[PDB]
mmCIF file with all atom_site columns, all heavy atoms in Angstrom:
data_model
loop_
_atom_site.group_PDB
_atom_site.id
_atom_site.type_symbol
_atom_site.label_atom_id
_atom_site.label_alt_id
_atom_site.label_comp_id
_atom_site.label_asym_id
_atom_site.label_entity_id
_atom_site.label_seq_id
_atom_site.pdbx_PDB_ins_code
_atom_site.Cartn_x
_atom_site.Cartn_y
_atom_site.Cartn_z
_atom_site.occupancy
_atom_site.B_iso_or_equiv
_atom_site.pdbx_formal_charge
_atom_site.auth_seq_id
_atom_site.auth_comp_id
_atom_site.auth_asym_id
_atom_site.auth_atom_id
_atom_site.pdbx_PDB_model_num
ATOM 1   N N   . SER A 1 1  ? -12.398 7.800   -3.196  1.00 14.16 ? 1  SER A N   1
ATOM 2   C CA  . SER A 1 1  ? -12.966 6.509   -2.743  1.00 14.16 ? 1  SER A CA  1
ATOM 3   C C   . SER A 1 1  ? -12.643 5.472   -3.793  1.00 14.16 ? 1  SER A C   1
ATOM 4   O O   . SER A 1 1  ? -12.776 5.698   -4.960  1.00 14.16 ? 1  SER A O   1
ATOM 5   C CB  . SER A 1 1  ? -14.456 6.607   -2.518  1.00 14.16 ? 1  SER A CB  1
ATOM 6   O OG  . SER A 1 1  ? -15.014 5.328   -2.216  1.00 14.16 ? 1  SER A OG  1
ATOM 7   N N   . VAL A 1 2  ? -12.237 4.269   -3.336  1.00 12.08 ? 2  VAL A N   1
ATOM 8   C CA  . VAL A 1 2  ? -11.682 3.213   -4.176  1.00 12.08 ? 2  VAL A CA  1
ATOM 9   C C   . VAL A 1 2  ? -12.449 1.926   -3.955  1.00 12.08 ? 2  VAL A C   1
ATOM 10  O O   . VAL A 1 2  ? -12.903 1.596   -2.861  1.00 12.08 ? 2  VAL A O   1
ATOM 11  C CB  . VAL A 1 2  ? -10.191 2.978   -3.923  1.00 12.08 ? 2  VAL A CB  1
ATOM 12  C CG1 . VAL A 1 2  ? -9.691  1.653   -4.437  1.00 12.08 ? 2  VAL A CG1 1
ATOM 13  C CG2 . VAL A 1 2  ? -9.389  4.129   -4.443  1.00 12.08 ? 2  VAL A CG2 1
ATOM 14  N N   . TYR A 1 3  ? -12.655 1.179   -5.082  1.00 11.55 ? 3  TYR A N   1
ATOM 15  C CA  . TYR A 1 3  ? -13.268 -0.155  -5.071  1.00 11.55 ? 3  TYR A CA  1
ATOM 16  C C   . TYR A 1 3  ? -12.303 -1.114  -5.739  1.00 11.55 ? 3  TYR A C   1
ATOM 17  O O   . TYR A 1 3  ? -11.836 -0.836  -6.855  1.00 11.55 ? 3  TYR A O   1
ATOM 18  C CB  . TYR A 1 3  ? -14.630 -0.110  -5.773  1.00 11.55 ? 3  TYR A CB  1
ATOM 19  C CG  . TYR A 1 3  ? -15.062 -1.420  -6.324  1.00 11.55 ? 3  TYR A CG  1
ATOM 20  C CD1 . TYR A 1 3  ? -15.374 -2.494  -5.478  1.00 11.55 ? 3  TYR A CD1 1
ATOM 21  C CD2 . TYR A 1 3  ? -15.302 -1.640  -7.712  1.00 11.55 ? 3  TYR A CD2 1
ATOM 22  C CE1 . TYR A 1 3  ? -15.817 -3.724  -5.970  1.00 11.55 ? 3  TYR A CE1 1
ATOM 23  C CE2 . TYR A 1 3  ? -15.740 -2.834  -8.199  1.00 11.55 ? 3  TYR A CE2 1
ATOM 24  C CZ  . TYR A 1 3  ? -15.997 -3.879  -7.358  1.00 11.55 ? 3  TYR A CZ  1
ATOM 25  O OH  . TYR A 1 3  ? -16.438 -5.054  -7.860  1.00 11.55 ? 3  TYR A OH  1
ATOM 26  N N   . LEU A 1 4  ? -11.966 -2.204  -5.071  1.00 8.63  ? 4  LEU A N   1
ATOM 27  C CA  . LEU A 1 4  ? -11.080 -3.212  -5.621  1.00 8.63  ? 4  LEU A CA  1
ATOM 28  C C   . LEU A 1 4  ? -11.857 -4.394  -6.122  1.00 8.63  ? 4  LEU A C   1
ATOM 29  O O   . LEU A 1 4  ? -12.356 -5.223  -5.327  1.00 8.63  ? 4  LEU A O   1
ATOM 30  C CB  . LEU A 1 4  ? -10.040 -3.671  -4.571  1.00 8.63  ? 4  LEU A CB  1
ATOM 31  C CG  . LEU A 1 4  ? -8.986  -4.658  -5.080  1.00 8.63  ? 4  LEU A CG  1
ATOM 32  C CD1 . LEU A 1 4  ? -8.096  -4.015  -6.109  1.00 8.63  ? 4  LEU A CD1 1
ATOM 33  C CD2 . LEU A 1 4  ? -8.198  -5.240  -3.952  1.00 8.63  ? 4  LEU A CD2 1
ATOM 34  N N   . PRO A 1 5  ? -12.056 -4.548  -7.439  1.00 7.29  ? 5  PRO A N   1
ATOM 35  C CA  . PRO A 1 5  ? -12.795 -5.691  -7.943  1.00 7.29  ? 5  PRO A CA  1
ATOM 36  C C   . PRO A 1 5  ? -12.053 -6.997  -7.629  1.00 7.29  ? 5  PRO A C   1
ATOM 37  O O   . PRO A 1 5  ? -10.837 -6.994  -7.456  1.00 7.29  ? 5  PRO A O   1
ATOM 38  C CB  . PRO A 1 5  ? -12.858 -5.517  -9.441  1.00 7.29  ? 5  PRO A CB  1
ATOM 39  C CG  . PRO A 1 5  ? -12.623 -4.023  -9.619  1.00 7.29  ? 5  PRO A CG  1
ATOM 40  C CD  . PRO A 1 5  ? -11.743 -3.607  -8.541  1.00 7.29  ? 5  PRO A CD  1
ATOM 41  N N   . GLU A 1 6  ? -12.830 -8.059  -7.588  1.00 5.31  ? 6  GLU A N   1
ATOM 42  C CA  . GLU A 1 6  ? -12.256 -9.410  -7.247  1.00 5.31  ? 6  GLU A CA  1
ATOM 43  C C   . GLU A 1 6  ? -11.271 -9.870  -8.308  1.00 5.31  ? 6  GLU A C   1
ATOM 44  O O   . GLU A 1 6  ? -10.420 -10.721 -8.024  1.00 5.31  ? 6  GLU A O   1
ATOM 45  C CB  . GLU A 1 6  ? -13.404 -10.428 -7.039  1.00 5.31  ? 6  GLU A CB  1
ATOM 46  C CG  . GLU A 1 6  ? -14.263 -10.173 -5.845  1.00 5.31  ? 6  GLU A CG  1
ATOM 47  C CD  . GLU A 1 6  ? -13.505 -10.268 -4.546  1.00 5.31  ? 6  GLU A CD  1
ATOM 48  O OE1 . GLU A 1 6  ? -12.724 -11.259 -4.371  1.00 5.31  ? 6  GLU A OE1 1
ATOM 49  O OE2 . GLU A 1 6  ? -13.627 -9.373  -3.716  1.00 5.31  ? 6  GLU A OE2 1
ATOM 50  N N   . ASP A 1 7  ? -11.421 -9.386  -9.543  1.00 3.69  ? 7  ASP A N   1
ATOM 51  C CA  . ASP A 1 7  ? -10.486 -9.719  -10.594 1.00 3.69  ? 7  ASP A CA  1
ATOM 52  C C   . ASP A 1 7  ? -9.424  -8.714  -10.818 1.00 3.69  ? 7  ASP A C   1
ATOM 53  O O   . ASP A 1 7  ? -8.795  -8.609  -11.900 1.00 3.69  ? 7  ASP A O   1
ATOM 54  C CB  . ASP A 1 7  ? -11.276 -9.933  -11.927 1.00 3.69  ? 7  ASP A CB  1
ATOM 55  C CG  . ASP A 1 7  ? -11.900 -8.595  -12.442 1.00 3.69  ? 7  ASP A CG  1
ATOM 56  O OD1 . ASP A 1 7  ? -12.111 -7.703  -11.613 1.00 3.69  ? 7  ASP A OD1 1
ATOM 57  O OD2 . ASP A 1 7  ? -12.116 -8.527  -13.653 1.00 3.69  ? 7  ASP A OD2 1
ATOM 58  N N   . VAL A 1 8  ? -9.090  -7.951  -9.736  1.00 3.84  ? 8  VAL A N   1
ATOM 59  C CA  . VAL A 1 8  ? -7.986  -6.981  -9.735  1.00 3.84  ? 8  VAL A CA  1
ATOM 60  C C   . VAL A 1 8  ? -7.182  -7.272  -8.445  1.00 3.84  ? 8  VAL A C   1
ATOM 61  O O   . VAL A 1 8  ? -7.716  -7.333  -7.365  1.00 3.84  ? 8  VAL A O   1
ATOM 62  C CB  . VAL A 1 8  ? -8.464  -5.542  -9.769  1.00 3.84  ? 8  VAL A CB  1
ATOM 63  C CG1 . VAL A 1 8  ? -7.244  -4.587  -9.639  1.00 3.84  ? 8  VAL A CG1 1
ATOM 64  C CG2 . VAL A 1 8  ? -9.184  -5.254  -11.055 1.00 3.84  ? 8  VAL A CG2 1
ATOM 65  N N   . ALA A 1 9  ? -5.857  -7.343  -8.600  1.00 7.13  ? 9  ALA A N   1
ATOM 66  C CA  . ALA A 1 9  ? -4.918  -7.626  -7.534  1.00 7.13  ? 9  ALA A CA  1
ATOM 67  C C   . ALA A 1 9  ? -4.009  -6.409  -7.381  1.00 7.13  ? 9  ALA A C   1
ATOM 68  O O   . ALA A 1 9  ? -3.581  -5.757  -8.356  1.00 7.13  ? 9  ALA A O   1
ATOM 69  C CB  . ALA A 1 9  ? -4.068  -8.857  -7.787  1.00 7.13  ? 9  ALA A CB  1
ATOM 70  N N   . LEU A 1 10 ? -3.716  -6.155  -6.071  1.00 6.62  ? 10 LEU A N   1
ATOM 71  C CA  . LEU A 1 10 ? -2.650  -5.133  -5.777  1.00 6.62  ? 10 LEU A CA  1
ATOM 72  C C   . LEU A 1 10 ? -1.328  -5.914  -5.644  1.00 6.62  ? 10 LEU A C   1
ATOM 73  O O   . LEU A 1 10 ? -1.091  -6.524  -4.600  1.00 6.62  ? 10 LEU A O   1
ATOM 74  C CB  . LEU A 1 10 ? -3.006  -4.351  -4.497  1.00 6.62  ? 10 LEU A CB  1
ATOM 75  C CG  . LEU A 1 10 ? -4.216  -3.400  -4.597  1.00 6.62  ? 10 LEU A CG  1
ATOM 76  C CD1 . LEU A 1 10 ? -4.524  -2.818  -3.238  1.00 6.62  ? 10 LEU A CD1 1
ATOM 77  C CD2 . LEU A 1 10 ? -3.971  -2.357  -5.611  1.00 6.62  ? 10 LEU A CD2 1
ATOM 78  N N   . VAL A 1 11 ? -0.519  -5.872  -6.651  1.00 3.40  ? 11 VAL A N   1
ATOM 79  C CA  . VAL A 1 11 ? 0.678   -6.657  -6.702  1.00 3.40  ? 11 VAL A CA  1
ATOM 80  C C   . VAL A 1 11 ? 1.793   -5.879  -5.973  1.00 3.40  ? 11 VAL A C   1
ATOM 81  O O   . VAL A 1 11 ? 2.158   -4.754  -6.452  1.00 3.40  ? 11 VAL A O   1
ATOM 82  C CB  . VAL A 1 11 ? 1.075   -6.904  -8.176  1.00 3.40  ? 11 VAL A CB  1
ATOM 83  C CG1 . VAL A 1 11 ? 2.301   -7.876  -8.231  1.00 3.40  ? 11 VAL A CG1 1
ATOM 84  C CG2 . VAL A 1 11 ? -0.045  -7.549  -8.940  1.00 3.40  ? 11 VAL A CG2 1
ATOM 85  N N   . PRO A 1 12 ? 2.341   -6.364  -4.859  1.00 4.78  ? 12 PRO A N   1
ATOM 86  C CA  . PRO A 1 12 ? 3.436   -5.681  -4.267  1.00 4.78  ? 12 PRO A CA  1
ATOM 87  C C   . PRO A 1 12 ? 4.695   -5.700  -5.097  1.00 4.78  ? 12 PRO A C   1
ATOM 88  O O   . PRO A 1 12 ? 5.020   -6.713  -5.729  1.00 4.78  ? 12 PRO A O   1
ATOM 89  C CB  . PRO A 1 12 ? 3.640   -6.476  -2.941  1.00 4.78  ? 12 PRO A CB  1
ATOM 90  C CG  . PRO A 1 12 ? 3.172   -7.799  -3.248  1.00 4.78  ? 12 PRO A CG  1
ATOM 91  C CD  . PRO A 1 12 ? 1.966   -7.573  -4.206  1.00 4.78  ? 12 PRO A CD  1
ATOM 92  N N   . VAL A 1 13 ? 5.357   -4.575  -5.157  1.00 5.10  ? 13 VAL A N   1
ATOM 93  C CA  . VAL A 1 13 ? 6.602   -4.441  -5.940  1.00 5.10  ? 13 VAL A CA  1
ATOM 94  C C   . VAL A 1 13 ? 7.765   -3.893  -5.136  1.00 5.10  ? 13 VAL A C   1
ATOM 95  O O   . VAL A 1 13 ? 8.919   -4.084  -5.540  1.00 5.10  ? 13 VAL A O   1
ATOM 96  C CB  . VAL A 1 13 ? 6.398   -3.661  -7.217  1.00 5.10  ? 13 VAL A CB  1
ATOM 97  C CG1 . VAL A 1 13 ? 5.315   -4.246  -8.105  1.00 5.10  ? 13 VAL A CG1 1
ATOM 98  C CG2 . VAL A 1 13 ? 6.033   -2.174  -6.831  1.00 5.10  ? 13 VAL A CG2 1
ATOM 99  N N   . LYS A 1 14 ? 7.516   -3.245  -3.994  1.00 4.96  ? 14 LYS A N   1
ATOM 100 C CA  . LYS A 1 14 ? 8.636   -2.675  -3.253  1.00 4.96  ? 14 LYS A CA  1
ATOM 101 C C   . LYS A 1 14 ? 8.171   -2.339  -1.863  1.00 4.96  ? 14 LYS A C   1
ATOM 102 O O   . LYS A 1 14 ? 7.050   -1.947  -1.576  1.00 4.96  ? 14 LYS A O   1
ATOM 103 C CB  . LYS A 1 14 ? 9.084   -1.401  -3.966  1.00 4.96  ? 14 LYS A CB  1
ATOM 104 C CG  . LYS A 1 14 ? 10.432  -0.952  -3.549  1.00 4.96  ? 14 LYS A CG  1
ATOM 105 C CD  . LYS A 1 14 ? 11.585  -1.916  -4.004  1.00 4.96  ? 14 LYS A CD  1
ATOM 106 C CE  . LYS A 1 14 ? 11.827  -1.839  -5.509  1.00 4.96  ? 14 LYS A CE  1
ATOM 107 N NZ  . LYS A 1 14 ? 11.877  -3.213  -6.101  1.00 4.96  ? 14 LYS A NZ  1
ATOM 108 N N   . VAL A 1 15 ? 9.101   -2.494  -0.919  1.00 3.60  ? 15 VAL A N   1
ATOM 109 C CA  . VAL A 1 15 ? 8.986   -2.011  0.468   1.00 3.60  ? 15 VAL A CA  1
ATOM 110 C C   . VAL A 1 15 ? 10.146  -1.055  0.752   1.00 3.60  ? 15 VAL A C   1
ATOM 111 O O   . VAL A 1 15 ? 11.335  -1.470  0.561   1.00 3.60  ? 15 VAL A O   1
ATOM 112 C CB  . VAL A 1 15 ? 8.935   -3.120  1.470   1.00 3.60  ? 15 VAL A CB  1
ATOM 113 C CG1 . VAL A 1 15 ? 8.755   -2.577  2.932   1.00 3.60  ? 15 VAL A CG1 1
ATOM 114 C CG2 . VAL A 1 15 ? 7.837   -4.113  1.145   1.00 3.60  ? 15 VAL A CG2 1
ATOM 115 N N   . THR A 1 16 ? 9.855   0.137   1.191   1.00 3.45  ? 16 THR A N   1
ATOM 116 C CA  . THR A 1 16 ? 10.898  1.136   1.317   1.00 3.45  ? 16 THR A CA  1
ATOM 117 C C   . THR A 1 16 ? 10.683  1.906   2.659   1.00 3.45  ? 16 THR A C   1
ATOM 118 O O   . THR A 1 16 ? 9.581   2.301   2.963   1.00 3.45  ? 16 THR A O   1
ATOM 119 C CB  . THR A 1 16 ? 10.883  2.145   0.196   1.00 3.45  ? 16 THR A CB  1
ATOM 120 O OG1 . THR A 1 16 ? 9.762   3.031   0.307   1.00 3.45  ? 16 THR A OG1 1
ATOM 121 C CG2 . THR A 1 16 ? 10.826  1.457   -1.127  1.00 3.45  ? 16 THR A CG2 1
ATOM 122 N N   . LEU A 1 17 ? 11.807  2.068   3.389   1.00 4.92  ? 17 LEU A N   1
ATOM 123 C CA  . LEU A 1 17 ? 11.784  2.959   4.533   1.00 4.92  ? 17 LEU A CA  1
ATOM 124 C C   . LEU A 1 17 ? 11.623  4.423   4.152   1.00 4.92  ? 17 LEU A C   1
ATOM 125 O O   . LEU A 1 17 ? 12.363  4.852   3.168   1.00 4.92  ? 17 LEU A O   1
ATOM 126 C CB  . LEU A 1 17 ? 13.113  2.707   5.350   1.00 4.92  ? 17 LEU A CB  1
ATOM 127 C CG  . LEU A 1 17 ? 13.391  3.622   6.528   1.00 4.92  ? 17 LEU A CG  1
ATOM 128 C CD1 . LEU A 1 17 ? 12.422  3.426   7.701   1.00 4.92  ? 17 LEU A CD1 1
ATOM 129 C CD2 . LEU A 1 17 ? 14.830  3.330   7.007   1.00 4.92  ? 17 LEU A CD2 1
ATOM 130 N N   . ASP A 1 18 ? 10.777  5.126   4.823   1.00 7.30  ? 18 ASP A N   1
ATOM 131 C CA  . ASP A 1 18 ? 10.483  6.488   4.417   1.00 7.30  ? 18 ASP A CA  1
ATOM 132 C C   . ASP A 1 18 ? 10.408  7.347   5.735   1.00 7.30  ? 18 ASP A C   1
ATOM 133 O O   . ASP A 1 18 ? 9.368   7.967   6.087   1.00 7.30  ? 18 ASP A O   1
ATOM 134 C CB  . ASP A 1 18 ? 9.140   6.588   3.667   1.00 7.30  ? 18 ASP A CB  1
ATOM 135 C CG  . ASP A 1 18 ? 8.873   7.960   3.200   1.00 7.30  ? 18 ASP A CG  1
ATOM 136 O OD1 . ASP A 1 18 ? 9.866   8.787   3.132   1.00 7.30  ? 18 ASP A OD1 1
ATOM 137 O OD2 . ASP A 1 18 ? 7.710   8.265   2.891   1.00 7.30  ? 18 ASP A OD2 1
ATOM 138 N N   . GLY A 1 19 ? 11.540  7.425   6.462   1.00 11.16 ? 19 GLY A N   1
ATOM 139 C CA  . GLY A 1 19 ? 11.602  8.301   7.582   1.00 11.16 ? 19 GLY A CA  1
ATOM 140 C C   . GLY A 1 19 ? 10.972  7.687   8.835   1.00 11.16 ? 19 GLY A C   1
ATOM 141 O O   . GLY A 1 19 ? 10.959  6.436   8.997   1.00 11.16 ? 19 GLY A O   1
ATOM 142 N N   . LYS A 1 20 ? 10.427  8.576   9.662   1.00 11.42 ? 20 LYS A N   1
ATOM 143 C CA  . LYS A 1 20 ? 9.845   8.116   10.931  1.00 11.42 ? 20 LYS A CA  1
ATOM 144 C C   . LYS A 1 20 ? 8.544   8.906   11.261  1.00 11.42 ? 20 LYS A C   1
ATOM 145 O O   . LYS A 1 20 ? 8.368   9.991   10.762  1.00 11.42 ? 20 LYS A O   1
ATOM 146 C CB  . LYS A 1 20 ? 10.794  8.283   12.121  1.00 11.42 ? 20 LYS A CB  1
ATOM 147 C CG  . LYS A 1 20 ? 12.113  7.606   11.939  1.00 11.42 ? 20 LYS A CG  1
ATOM 148 C CD  . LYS A 1 20 ? 12.848  7.526   13.245  1.00 11.42 ? 20 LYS A CD  1
ATOM 149 C CE  . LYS A 1 20 ? 13.750  6.339   13.356  1.00 11.42 ? 20 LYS A CE  1
ATOM 150 N NZ  . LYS A 1 20 ? 13.278  5.420   14.364  1.00 11.42 ? 20 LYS A NZ  1
ATOM 151 N N   . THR A 1 21 ? 7.700   8.294   12.000  1.00 14.69 ? 21 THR A N   1
ATOM 152 C CA  . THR A 1 21 ? 6.514   8.973   12.552  1.00 14.69 ? 21 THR A CA  1
ATOM 153 C C   . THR A 1 21 ? 6.921   9.884   13.732  1.00 14.69 ? 21 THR A C   1
ATOM 154 O O   . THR A 1 21 ? 8.037   9.858   14.244  1.00 14.69 ? 21 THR A O   1
ATOM 155 C CB  . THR A 1 21 ? 5.500   7.937   12.986  1.00 14.69 ? 21 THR A CB  1
ATOM 156 O OG1 . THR A 1 21 ? 5.936   7.311   14.222  1.00 14.69 ? 21 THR A OG1 1
ATOM 157 C CG2 . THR A 1 21 ? 5.186   6.948   11.952  1.00 14.69 ? 21 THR A CG2 1
ATOM 158 N N   . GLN A 1 22 ? 5.955   10.691  14.110  1.00 15.15 ? 22 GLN A N   1
ATOM 159 C CA  . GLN A 1 22 ? 6.178   11.542  15.298  1.00 15.15 ? 22 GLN A CA  1
ATOM 160 C C   . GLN A 1 22 ? 6.457   10.682  16.549  1.00 15.15 ? 22 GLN A C   1
ATOM 161 O O   . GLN A 1 22 ? 7.068   11.202  17.507  1.00 15.15 ? 22 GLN A O   1
ATOM 162 C CB  . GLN A 1 22 ? 4.973   12.432  15.532  1.00 15.15 ? 22 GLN A CB  1
ATOM 163 C CG  . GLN A 1 22 ? 4.786   13.519  14.422  1.00 15.15 ? 22 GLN A CG  1
ATOM 164 C CD  . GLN A 1 22 ? 6.049   14.399  14.325  1.00 15.15 ? 22 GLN A CD  1
ATOM 165 O OE1 . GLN A 1 22 ? 6.418   15.092  15.231  1.00 15.15 ? 22 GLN A OE1 1
ATOM 166 N NE2 . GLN A 1 22 ? 6.641   14.388  13.099  1.00 15.15 ? 22 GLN A NE2 1
ATOM 167 N N   . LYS A 1 23 ? 6.041   9.414   16.542  1.00 15.87 ? 23 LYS A N   1
ATOM 168 C CA  . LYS A 1 23 ? 6.257   8.522   17.640  1.00 15.87 ? 23 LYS A CA  1
ATOM 169 C C   . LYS A 1 23 ? 7.565   7.857   17.576  1.00 15.87 ? 23 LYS A C   1
ATOM 170 O O   . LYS A 1 23 ? 7.887   6.960   18.439  1.00 15.87 ? 23 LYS A O   1
ATOM 171 C CB  . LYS A 1 23 ? 5.154   7.431   17.646  1.00 15.87 ? 23 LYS A CB  1
ATOM 172 C CG  . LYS A 1 23 ? 3.755   7.965   17.669  1.00 15.87 ? 23 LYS A CG  1
ATOM 173 C CD  . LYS A 1 23 ? 2.751   6.848   17.801  1.00 15.87 ? 23 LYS A CD  1
ATOM 174 C CE  . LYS A 1 23 ? 1.418   7.122   17.117  1.00 15.87 ? 23 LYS A CE  1
ATOM 175 N NZ  . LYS A 1 23 ? 1.581   7.109   15.634  1.00 15.87 ? 23 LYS A NZ  1
ATOM 176 N N   . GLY A 1 24 ? 8.497   8.157   16.649  1.00 15.26 ? 24 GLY A N   1
ATOM 177 C CA  . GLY A 1 24 ? 9.755   7.554   16.583  1.00 15.26 ? 24 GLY A CA  1
ATOM 178 C C   . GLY A 1 24 ? 9.790   6.176   15.845  1.00 15.26 ? 24 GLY A C   1
ATOM 179 O O   . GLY A 1 24 ? 10.846  5.583   15.735  1.00 15.26 ? 24 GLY A O   1
#
């Protein structure tokens, strides 16, 4: 379980394709 404080940001650094779901 995770808590994100207001003074903490989730900084995006990368978007990567990682295969496919069972739904294609």
Side-chain angles (χ1 to χ4, degrees):
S1 177
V2 163
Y3 157 63
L4 183 66
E6 293 297 311
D7 66 336
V8 174
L10 292 174
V11 184
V13 301
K14 198 68 73 227
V15 182
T16 73
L17 175 65
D18 186 19
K20 305 194 151 247
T21 70
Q22 292 302 300
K23 305 188 212 69

